[PDB]
Ligand binder design. Structure first.
Ligand SMILES: [N]S(=O)(=O)[C][C]C1234B567B89%10B%11%12%13B85%14B%1158B%12%11%15B%139%12B%1061B%12%112C5%153B%14874
Ligand SMILES: [Zn+2]
Length: 257
């Protein structure tokens, strides 16, 4: 039932998922002046050299690129994390226009899109078990602004015409997610949640300070996707972002001064 429209969007989700009004919901606004520099935070360790992408999929809420998470081939460690987190998939959230699309905001600024690289804690064995734990997932969030093209995104862009409508997938092997990362791994971190149903409070969020630039042509291809299935009335997959939620009793920590 849930989606991003008037009648099934974020303001409705608490009816099926009451944790929507919980104590550690995501995304949030990152108030940069209030975030505390924490000299105890480690550099983030991103080890993607042996990543194995499998498929690209439109599931009616975003598109995702899925990885082989049956071994420690593409792992996130360090930073605020204890232990080792396997990359399951990445996906994006984006807007109908360049002034909205991100889920996190920075001093209330919205970016055109936000990339989420979703990882789960190997100590829980599988993602389903991990989503039931407060330290089950680590999502690496990367902002997208519109300017110069991101060359490492183009292979993704170019196959979106083959997964237009909900329920389409395609082979998507040999994709290297290192080509989506900004120079700096400086980050903010806080305890939060999945930003889509089931909104489980299982995520350590790691949001990079440095956005990547993508071109207008690249983001326009995102906007040609459809929320609908083939044969149903065409509804552009745009504005698939949850707004900032109350910070409540949480501290955002910065890895950098
Ligand atoms: N937007 S997000 O918080 O990164 C949650 C995205 C997910 B990945 B795992 B299941 B797969 B399905 B559910 B679980 B995580 B939530 C949706 B996607
Ligand atoms: Zn997401």
């Amino acid at each position: 039932h849930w989606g991003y429209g008037k009648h099934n969007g974020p303001e409705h989700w608490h009816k099926d998922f009451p944790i929507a009004k919980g104590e550690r919901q995501s995304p949030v606004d990152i108030d940069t002046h209030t975030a505390k520099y924490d000299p105890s935070l480690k550099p983030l360790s991103v080890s993607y050299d042996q990543a194995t992408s499998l498929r690209i999929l439109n599931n009616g809420h975003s598109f995702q690129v899925t990885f082989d998470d049956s071994q420690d081939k593409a792992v996130l460690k360090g930073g605020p994390l204890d232990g080792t987190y396997r990359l399951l998939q990445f996906h994006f959230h984006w807007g109908s226009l360049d002034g909205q699309g991100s889920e996190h905001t920075v001093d209330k600024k919205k970016y055109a899109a936000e990339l989420h690289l979703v990882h789960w804690n190997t100590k829980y064995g599988d993602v389903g078990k991990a989503v039931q734990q407060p330290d089950g997932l680590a999502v690496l969030g990367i902002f997208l602004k519109v300017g110069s093209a991101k060359p490492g995104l183009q292979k993704v862009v170019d196959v979106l015409d083959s997964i237009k409508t909900e329920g389409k997938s395609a082979d998507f092997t040999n994709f290297d997610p290192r080509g989506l990362l900004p120079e700096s791994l400086d980050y903010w971190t806080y305890p939060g949640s999945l930003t889509t149903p089931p909104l489980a409070e299982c995520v350590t969020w790691i949001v990079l300070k440095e956005p990547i630039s993508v071109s207008s042509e690249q983001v326009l291809k995102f906007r040609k996707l459809n929320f609908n299935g083939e044969g149903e009335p065409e509804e552009l997959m745009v504005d698939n972002w949850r707004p900032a939620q109350p910070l409540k009793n949480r501290q955002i920590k910065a890895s950098f001064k």
